[PDB]
Design a binder for this molecule. Structure first.
Ligand SMILES: CCCCCCCCCCCCCCCCCC(=O)OC[C@H](COP(=O)([O-])OCC(O)COP(=O)([O-])OC[C@@H](COC(=O)CCCCCCCCCCCCCCCCC)OC(=O)CCCCCCCCCCCCCCCCC)OC(=O)CCCCCCCCCCCCCCCCC
Ligand SMILES: CCCCCCCCCCCCCCCCCC(=O)OC[C@H](COP(=O)(O)OCCN)OC(=O)CCCCCCCCCCCCCCCCC
Ligand SMILES: CCCCCCCCCCCCCCCCCC(=O)OC[C@H](COP(=O)(O)OCCN)OC(=O)CCCCCCCCCCCCCCCCC
Ligand SMILES: CCCCCCCCCCCCCCCCCC(=O)OC[C@H](COP(=O)(O)OCCN)OC(=O)CCCCCCCCCCCCCCCCC
Ligand SMILES: CCCCCCCCCCCCCCCCCC(=O)OC[C@H](COP(=O)(O)OCCN)OC(=O)CCCCCCCCCCCCCCCCC
Ligand SMILES: CCCCCCCCCCCCCCCCCC(=O)OC[C@H](COP(=O)(O)OCCN)OC(=O)CCCCCCCCCCCCCCCCC
Ligand SMILES: CCCCCCCCCCCCCCCCCC(=O)OC[C@H](COP(=O)(O)OCCN)OC(=O)CCCCCCCCCCCCCCCCC
Ligand SMILES: CCCCCCCCCCCCO[C@@H]1O[C@H](CO)[C@@H](O[C@H]2O[C@H](CO)[C@@H](O)[C@H](O)[C@H]2O)[C@H](O)[C@H]1O
Ligand SMILES: CCCCCCCCCCCCO[C@@H]1O[C@H](CO)[C@@H](O[C@H]2O[C@H](CO)[C@@H](O)[C@H](O)[C@H]2O)[C@H](O)[C@H]1O
Ligand SMILES: CCCCCCCCCCCCO[C@@H]1O[C@H](CO)[C@@H](O[C@H]2O[C@H](CO)[C@@H](O)[C@H](O)[C@H]2O)[C@H](O)[C@H]1O
Ligand SMILES: CCCCCCCCCCCCO[C@@H]1O[C@H](CO)[C@@H](O[C@H]2O[C@H](CO)[C@@H](O)[C@H](O)[C@H]2O)[C@H](O)[C@H]1O
Ligand SMILES: CCCCCCCCCCCCO[C@@H]1O[C@H](CO)[C@@H](O[C@H]2O[C@H](CO)[C@@H](O)[C@H](O)[C@H]2O)[C@H](O)[C@H]1O
Ligand SMILES: N=C(N)NC(=N)NCCc1ccc(I)c(Cl)c1
Ligand SMILES: N=C(N)NC(=N)NCCc1ccc(I)c(Cl)c1
Lengths: 174, 95, 347, 311, 83, 104, 96, 98, 69
């Protein structure tokens, strides 16, 4: 059901993580992270975070992950190794999927599961808020408050980014 | 803070975002505003050793609002019972 | 490095630390650590060689991992209390994660492997920062979250650090590795007393920093990084050999020198809490440190090792390195015990 | 009823791309004192059909790629994302009415660089990989100014909704208050779409085939049209009459057609930039001005008392 | 005054793009402080009612609080209608 | 649901066009006719890294259209200009340090 | 030109926002009754479903406080057709 | 807790184990580090959005910005390692063994 | 002559005209002859959901006036 969309997305989220965390060729590992990023944006979208969802796409996938792929093509892997060709990667990949499937199957059968800690399995919709009728996005109000409330945050964030530029020019000059 | 420079200078560098019952844009309240307000006012000034015992009631309620563990458990209980009756024909839901 | 850039990078290392110390918000604490780690890397890399690049990479991986674990602890704390205030955490799993993260940042055993290697691979001035200024921010967080730390975890880390630091230093001829293992041992005393009296943690931290700065500054003065190179000091700067002797004995905790004061005070606080086995075990184990401190005094000051002929050319030139604050620090490093009651200013 | 609507966007987009190949050839021809296609169908109207059929029945010569999955992925990503860029466009009503539509287009367009990168990896040739990386560097560089220019314009619009640009320009085109940004925006789209004088992928390899070649070409030309439709909305806002939405669609189409023809006009008129020179046009010319105009457009509504509404 | 004028003419001849950038950035920093309309942006932002105006319990000594929205007490937007 | 359907249609059609573009009748009956430093300049690394840092700054400027609706305009305008000026200082630093050069 | 139009647009937003303020009391009154009716209806089915479950008090709060607490989605739409639950939970987010 | 939290925490654990269990490529380990950031971003965003903690809505952005700057530093170290040895293999970074 | 470029342009223009025209008329067909309701904010969605219940046929675009008073 579409009532479990958030849960389903989080299942794919984990599968993408078991994908690159098993560490295949950095080219394929990058693909697994890109898929996870998109699935992660969808999870954030369904909780009412449109801007935060699109920042993952704009900045995390279009920004950082592009530079990761760019750097991989330059200084790491130019041609991928066959995926799951190494036994260690396959064992790790299979093990994570087997663990994940058991969690999913048990939480769906009992509508709850205790994997270390106890979780509910009724669906994530149950915790949602029931009274919204404002003429604005609350997430947008909060982020816009960076410029009124967050003067200190802007100063230290802006400073760190400038120092990042200076630092990386020092590191790479060699 | 280790060095409480903020209070010495009366300048608010990050206190504004520490709790959800603080002032928010356009007076948008957090879902657990009343519970966090109650717990904060109960525990104010008496120290964390005392508060851990004397404000346990407010903190348990605030935690229930935060994660709703007891509410979900109750809903899970009623739903599970309903499935049994549907599986036994002793209950037909209304319209 | 351009001197103005060096200054700005150094000021950013300090600013990252200060943000951690003045912050009341976990996010700003995390930012302070991130800013601090960003600025430290260039000074580790500044001599451009494969060893420096390996040291910076090992440092980056350790610190970035620890900072992710810290962020995870903060977020778990947010879910279980709905607030960001820097104070006791409201979840035992959050407390463990934050404690482990701070242990990794401090290089406490069994997360210690990076300290000897990173210190070896960077210049002396960079190692001085790494082993002194860089301990301030993680210690200042432990100072605030200790009411919620697991006692068994923190004391296990302390005991392991004193053991690993003492044993690890016995096998070293490189001065930078000796200071690294010495740092691991001293972090153990700082955290062992934290659950009982954080003021003694501050006292041990301050005295540790003063003594460590004195050693690094004296090593820089003569450009010495090995035991044998240090053993030539007697034939160039005899005064330095005496200052090293006093500082090493102080670092060994011998009375009536300054370095005895932290061990003295920590033992007192622990016994007041009916902790008798742990202080005694700690004090005996610290004799391992005293041993490899004494070995250095033998090859530096108390005997005269063989020299070289080219050393005579060095006789005709004076020391030109800054040695900033060295006269002040060496006096504090050795002659402070009569002023022990002054520790109350740290309350 | 909504699936009908999706098809009535996809199919005309692909047909418009096909016949842009004809129009580009004929406009370039007449600017070169010749005719261009005029034999295959009357006035060359069947030329796009002959080309399309030819390409698809052509032998699909793909050398043994270093990655089968990434060889297939690149054209699918390129074409799939290109069509996605159209779904929030108000013409005057969007297929999908997004509150953050402008931000959605920026985020999707930033993903299009992966098709360049993946096709470089799949080529199994360090020479083509190096060509891919040079193209990626050009593309991301000009993404910087496009985002900042777009932000500056929205400070006069008040929101990220694309249809709010229509409201903002009810009295006057935004090109009048913002012609300096329109100038750099327009050139940035040329460089973004690797169009001459920024067509350095084509020029440098001078100094894919069949259907898979055709698909990359279709995605490129879909992006070219979409960029010019975006420019018309951003700077040449058409008035919308809710009772006659087709008057908006006619006028807005003409502006987009003309803007697209100006892409062909420019291609006919200038030599090609060197790679380092189009890098300097961005980092040392556009970016300093864009940053200064971004500062100016934050201040201007505040100092004039012309802050737009949020809703 | 002249050596600066001789400086500007050189950068205007050599780097007109940079001269324009710096000129625009300076106006963006300076003009808000000089403009007489800047004060209205504050007022208009405050005049926009995003949330409900919760009424006050009347204790009998609030002569400056209107009883009805169409009464003459309370803030007026006449200044905004003209603007 | 509509956006999901649009996305699913766009990439499903793209997939169908790609596969059919690969598998069409050919009318022939005979046999058909690694992870190192790529020789690529450090300059191209610095472009990508420079793009990333500027992109992170852009993420912080994106809320500006909403921030201009605040009553705390004095603070908001000061912080917007501060961030953009710092972005300009970043560019000035790369420029004067020959980070934007392509020679050598 | 942009200044004049934007000022007019700000006046049009204020008029639109004030129409909403005029209607909020009526909408709030309606919302209160709908919520209370839904909770009451769930309380009848709870009485029936949990009639023969030992140690189950019907309608027992999970909070120590007697203050009114806003219910979450699961409490209101706990026992209703998925079509309504989906519309209530994800209808706004998914609307185009 | 809610069902989604089970998988988000699982994703973080999976990437942490991936990070602590190195293979050969340094880039593969840097990807795991970004994976932990992405899971932290999602977990923080979900918690903040669901609780309607309005002013905390900017926190995930700050997390993203700072961690991307961290990743840029990490990539720069990787290329310097690759310039030295011709690969990004961690086994080459063992000089400080002695 | 140059005007022989126009037929290709006309075909291109009609192709670009169909998307906008189709969406506009499909919206009118599916929304009772009116513009499709825009709900970017919770308030607008709340009123649209209230209209659906008030309609009596579960159609937010079916309006009820004074005849229901
Ligand atoms: C109670 C607990 C136990 C006791 C606590 C003790 C705590 C420490 C106390 C402070 C110690 C500071 C050092 C003492 C000053 C002596 C140095 C001196 O004579 O410099 C004269 C100094 C330069 O003399 P010099 O020829 O370069 O050699 C002096 C030393 O070698 C200079 O070599 P240096 O590298 O060591 O210089 C250090 C100093 C830089 O040197 C200085 O200028 C000394 C400044 C001392 C400031 C006085 C601090 C007390 C006031 C508190 C406020 O650094 C500073 O900036 C000061 C911190 O002349 C001045 O300019 C005087 C300062 C003008 C203001
Ligand atoms: C070597 C490395 C490991 C270090 C040795 C291991 C620790 C051995 C400890 C022996 C047991 C001492 C002890 O724990 O006594 C604790 C107990 C505290 O109880 P309390 O509440 O204060 O008073 C009532 C008494 N139950 O009662 C007391 O506190 C009384 C004990 C007074 C302090 C004892 C000091 C240490 C004794 C052990 C060393 C003695 C042998 C020294 C030999 C050295 C020869 C060179
Ligand atoms: C109380 C303890 C006070 C400690 C004072 C230590 C001052 C430094 C010792 C003097 C040594 C000479 C010197 O100038 O410092 C060296 C170092 C700069 O490195 P260097 O190679 O000499 O030249 C830089 C060109 N790149 O300069 C530095 O980077 C200074 C490094 C030390 C900073 C950390 C000091 C410990 C923390 C003190 C805070 C106490 C709380
Ligand atoms: C006040 C209350 C607190 C009480 C705690 C105890 C305080 C003592 C610790 C103070 C700190 C140590 C300061 C010692 C200053 C040393 C200066 C000195 O004694 O002379 C050094 C001497 C000079 O040699 P030179 O440079 O050549 O000049 C003369 C020309 N031949 O250099 C030489 O000639 C080399 C000499 C050979 C090495 C002999 C070493 C044995 C003497 C050690 C003296 C220092 C004691 C250190 C341990 C502390 C003792 C309690
Ligand atoms: C220097 C060379 C640069 C070349 C770059 C390419 C530039 C191409 C420019 C294309 C745009 C040309 C405009 C075409 C007009 C289309 C026909 C039309 O309907 O014009 C109507 C327009 C006034 O109406 P309207 O556009 O709705 O403006 C109201 C404000 N919303 O008309 C009134 O003005
Ligand atoms: C409308 C105009 C009206 C005229 C009157 C207005 C008067 C007020 C404005 C006066 C401003 C004057 C300041 C101009 C500064 C010019 C500095 C300069 O000329 O440096 C050029 C040079 C870079 O040029 P390059 O070719 O790379 O190297 C030279 C070798 N031929 O050297 C350099 O490295 C360039 C400097 C570094 C890059 C600076 C980047 C600027 C910051 C970017 C953002 C733009 C400003 C803020 C937004
Ligand atoms: C290796 C292959 C790589 C290929 C990658 C290619 C990328 C293809 C594109 C991926 C799609 C990402 C989806 C991003 C949509 C974000 C747009 C948006 O924010 O609005 C859509 C809608 C909310 O609409 P909105 O108006 O903003 O707010 C609600 C009413 N005010 O929000 C929704 O409709 C909710 C939809 C949730 C499901 C999104 C799942 C995305 C997963 C993609 C992977
Ligand atoms: C290395 C560089 C170091 C630079 C150090 C610079 C320190 C700058 C401190 C900035 C914070 C100044 O002090 C703080 O500022 C902001 C805006 O001015 C004020 O905040 C104001 O805007 C928002 C609006 O709701 C709220 O925070 C508050 O309602 C209001 O007072 C704080 O009330 C004030 O306490
Ligand atoms: C090193 C791997 C890091 C992976 C981190 C993975 C995420 C960790 C999730 C921590 C959140 C769950 O944290 C856990 O929650 C439960 C209830 O919810 C708490 O409560 C639990 O123990 C206490 C014991 O007095 C009681 O409340 C109760 O018996 C039980 O529910 C635990 O005290 C807390 O530790
Ligand atoms: C867009 C829809 C169009 C629908 C049209 C449907 C027509 C279906 C009939 C396809 C006819 C293709 O015709 C055939 O194409 C392939 C392209 O690989 C050519 O090439 C093929 O044959 C030659 C030898 O003859 C081989 O060496 C070659 O490797 C092989 O690919 C053939 O020489 C040509 O005869
Ligand atoms: C009016 C204020 C508006 C706010 C502006 C926003 C902040 C922008 C900060 C940019 C600072 C750039 O500062 C810039 O530094 C270099 C120093 O090498 C100077 O340029 C100097 O070096 C270059 C070589 O690169 C020489 O060819 C040149 O002759 C010399 O002037 C520039 O003249 C100066 O403009
Ligand atoms: C590298 C560091 C870069 C830092 C750059 C910072 C530059 C800041 C420049 C603009 C700061 C002042 O900008 C503008 O000044 C005028 C003063 O007349 C302020 O005052 C104006 O607006 C306020 C509203 O709050 C009115 O009450 C007031 O009557 C009016 O004069 C504005 O609120 C402020 O928006
Ligand atoms: N935490 C501890 N165990 N010790 C501690 N700080 N006790 C507080 C007692 C104390 C002791 C000395 C002073 I001077 C002051 Cl003012 C107060
Ligand atoms: N650049 C030009 N305009 N001429 C040109 N070489 N066109 C390419 C021809 C082409 C490619 C794909 C498709 I689908 C179609 Cl129908 C036609």
């Amino acid at each position: 059901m579409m009532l479990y969309i958030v849960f389903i997305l989080s299942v794919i989220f984990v599968m993408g993580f078991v994908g690159f965390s098993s560490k295949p060729s950095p080219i394929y590992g990058g693909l697994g992270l890109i898929v996870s990023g998109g699935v992660g944006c969808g999870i954030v979208l369904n909780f009412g975070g449109s801007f935060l969802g699109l920042m993952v796409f704009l900045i995390y996938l279009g920004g950082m992950m592009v530079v990761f792929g760019y750097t991989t093509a330059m200084a790491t892997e130019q041609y991928p190794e066959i995926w799951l060709s190494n036994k260690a990667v396959l064992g790790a990949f299979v093990t994570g999927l087997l663990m994940e499937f058991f969690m999913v199957y048990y939480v769906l059968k009992d509508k709850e599961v205790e994997v270390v800690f106890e979780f509910n399995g009724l669906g994530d919709w149950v915790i949602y808020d029931t009274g919204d009728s404002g003429f604005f996005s609350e997430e947008a109000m909060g982020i816009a408050a960076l410029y009124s409330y967050g003067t200190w945050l802007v100063i230290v964030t802006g400073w760190s980014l400038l120092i990042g530029v200076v630092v990386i020019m020092e590191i790479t000059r060699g | 803070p280790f060095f409480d420079v903020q209070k010495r200078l009366g300048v608010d560098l990050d206190r504004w975002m520490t709790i959800q019952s603080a002032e928010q844009p356009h007076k948008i309240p957090s879902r657990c505003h009343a519970f966090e307000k109650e717990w904060i006012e109960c525990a104010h000034g008496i120290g964390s050793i005392r508060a851990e015992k004397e404000c346990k009631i407010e903190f348990e309620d605030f935690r229930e609002c935060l994660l709703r563990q007891k509410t979900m458990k109750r809903l899970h209980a009623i739903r599970r019972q309903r499935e049994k009756l549907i599986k036994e024909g002793k209950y037909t839901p209304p319209p | 490095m351009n001197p103005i850039i060096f200054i700005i990078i150094l000021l950013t290392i300090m600013l990252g630390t200060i943000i951690v110390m003045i912050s009341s918000h976990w996010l700003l604490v995390w930012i302070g650590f991130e800013m601090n780690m960003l600025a430290i890397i260039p000074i580790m890399m500044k001599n451009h060689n494969p060893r420096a690049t390996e040291a910076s990479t090992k440092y980056f991986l350790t610190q970035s991992t620890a900072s992710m674990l810290l962020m995870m602890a903060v977020i778990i704390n947010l879910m279980f209390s709905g607030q960001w205030t820097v104070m006791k955490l409201f979840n035992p799993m959050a407390s463990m994660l934050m404690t482990m993260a701070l242990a990794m940042k401090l290089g406490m055993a069994p997360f210690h492997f990076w300290v000897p290697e990173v210190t070896q691979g960077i210049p002396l001035s960079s190692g001085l920062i790494l082993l002194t200024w860089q301990k301030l921010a993680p210690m200042s967080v432990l100072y605030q979250i200790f009411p919620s730390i697991n006692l068994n975890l923190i004391l296990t880390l302390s005991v392991l650090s004193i053991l690993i630091g003492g044993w690890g230093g016995l096998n070293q001829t490189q001065l930078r590795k000796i200071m690294a293992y010495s740092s691991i041992a001293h972090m153990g005393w700082m955290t062992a007393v934290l659950p009982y009296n954080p003021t003694m943690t501050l006292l041990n931290l301050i005295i540790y920093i003063i003594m460590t700065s004195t050693m690094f500054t004296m090593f820089m003065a003569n450009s010495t990084t090995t035991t044998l190179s240090l053993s030539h000091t007697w034939n160039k700067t005899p005064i330095m050999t005496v200052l090293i002797l006093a500082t090493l004995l102080s670092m060994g905790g011998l009375p009536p020198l300054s370095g005895f004061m932290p061990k003295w005070m920590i033992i007192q606080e622990m016994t007041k809490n009916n902790s008798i086995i742990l202080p005694t075990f700690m004090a005996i184990t610290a004799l391992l440190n005293l041993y490899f401190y004494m070995r250095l005094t033998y090859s530096t000051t108390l005997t005269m090792f063989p020299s070289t002929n080219n050393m005579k050319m060095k006789w005709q030139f004076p020391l030109m390195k800054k040695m900033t604050f060295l006269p002040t620090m060496v006096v504090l490093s050795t002659m402070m015990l009569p002023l022990t009651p002054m520790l109350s200013v740290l309350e | 009823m909504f699936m009908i609507n999706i098809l009535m966007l996809i199919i005309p987009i692909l047909l418009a791309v096909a016949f842009l190949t004809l129009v580009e050839r004929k406009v370039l021809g007449y600017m070169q004192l010749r005719k261009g296609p005029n034999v295959v169908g009357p006035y060359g109207l069947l030329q796009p059909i002959a080309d399309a059929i030819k390409l698809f029945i052509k032998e699909p010569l793909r050398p043994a790629t270093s990655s089968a999955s990434m060889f297939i992925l690149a054209p699918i990503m390129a074409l799939g994302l290109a069509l996605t860029m159209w779904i929030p466009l108000p013409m005057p009503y969007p297929l999908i009415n997004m509150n953050l539509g402008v931000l959605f287009m920026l985020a999707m367009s930033s993903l299009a660089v992966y098709s360049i990168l993946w096709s470089g990896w799949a080529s199994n040739s360090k020479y083509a990989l190096i060509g891919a990386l040079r193209a990626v560097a050009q593309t991301i560089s000009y993404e910087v100014t496009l985002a900042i220019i777009l932000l500056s314009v929205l400070l006069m619009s008040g929101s990220f909704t694309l249809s709010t640009l229509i409201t903002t320009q009810e009295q006057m085109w935004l090109i009048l208050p913002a012609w300096p940004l329109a100038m750099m925006w327009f050139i940035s789209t040329l460089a973004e779409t690797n169009r001459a004088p920024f067509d350095l992928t084509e020029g440098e390899s001078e100094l894919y085939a069949a259907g898979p070649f055709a698909l990359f070409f279709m995605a490129e030309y879909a992006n070219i049209i979409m960029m010019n439709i975006f420019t018309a909305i951003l700077f040449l806002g058409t008035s919308h009459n809710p009772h006659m939405p087709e008057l908006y669609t006619i006028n807005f189409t003409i502006k987009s057609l003309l803007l697209t023809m100006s892409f062909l006009w420019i291609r006919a008129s200038y030599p090609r930039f060197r790679y380092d020179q189009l890098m300097h046009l961005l980092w040392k010319n556009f970016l300093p001005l864009t940053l200064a105009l971004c500062m100016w457009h934050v201040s201007l509504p505040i100092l004039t008392s012309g802050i737009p509404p949020q809703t | 005054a002249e050596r600066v004028a001789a400086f500007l003419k050189n950068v205007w001849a050599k780097e007109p793009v940079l001269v324009a950038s710096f000129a625009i950035a300076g106006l963006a920093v300076i003009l808000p402080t000089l403009s007489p309309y800047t004060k209205y942006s504050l007022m208009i932002n405050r005049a926009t009612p995003y949330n409900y105006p919760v009424p006050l319990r009347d204790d009998g000594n609030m002569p400056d609080v209107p009883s009805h929205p169409q009464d003459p007490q309370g803030p007026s937007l006449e200044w905004l209608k003209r603007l | 649901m509509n956006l999901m359907l649009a996305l699913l249609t766009n990439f499903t059609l793209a997939t169908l066009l790609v596969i059919i573009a690969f598998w069409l009748p050919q009318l022939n009956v005979y046999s058909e006719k690694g992870s190192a430093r790529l020789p690529f300049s450090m300059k191209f690394f610095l472009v990508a890294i420079t793009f990333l840092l500027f992109d992170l700054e852009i993420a912080l400027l994106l809320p500006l259209p909403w921030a201009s609706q605040t009553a705390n305009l004095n603070t908001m305008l000061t912080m917007a200009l501060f961030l953009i000026i710092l972005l300009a200082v970043s560019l000035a630093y790369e420029w004067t340090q020959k980070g934007l050069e392509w020679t050598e | 030109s942009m200044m004049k139009w934007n000022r007019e647009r700000r006046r049009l937003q204020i008029e639109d926002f004030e129409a909403r303020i005029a209607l909020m009391p009526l909408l709030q009154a309606e919302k209160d009754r709908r919520v209370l009716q839904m909770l009451r209806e769930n309380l009848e089915e709870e009485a029936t479903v949990m009639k023969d479950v030992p140690g189950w008090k019907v309608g027992e709060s999970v909070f120590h406080t007697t203050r009114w607490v806003t219910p979450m989605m699961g409490e209101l739409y706990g026992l209703r057709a998925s079509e309504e639950v989906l519309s209530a939970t994800y209808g706004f987010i998914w609307y185009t | 807790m809610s069902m989604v939290y089970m998988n988000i925490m699982m994703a973080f654990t999976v990437s942490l184990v991936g990070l602590l269990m190195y293979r050969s490529h340094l880039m593969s380990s840097l990807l795991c580090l970004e994976g932990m950031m992405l899971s932290l971003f999602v977990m923080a965003a979900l918690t903040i959005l669901n609780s309607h903690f309005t002013l905390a809505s900017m926190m995930p952005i700050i997390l993203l910005v700072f961690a991307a700057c961290e990743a840029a530093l990490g990539l720069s170290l990787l290329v310097m390692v690759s310039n030295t040895y011709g690969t990004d293999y961690v086994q080459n970074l063992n000089l400080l063994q002695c | 002559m140059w005007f022989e470029v126009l037929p290709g342009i006309a075909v291109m223009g009609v192709c670009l005209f169909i998307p906008g025209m189709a969406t506009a008329r499909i919206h009118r067909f599916s929304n009772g002859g009116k513009e499709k309701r825009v709900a970017h904010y919770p308030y607008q969605w709340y009123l649209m959901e209230r209209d659906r219940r008030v309609s009596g046929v579960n159609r937010s675009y079916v309006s009820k006036g004074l005849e229901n008073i």
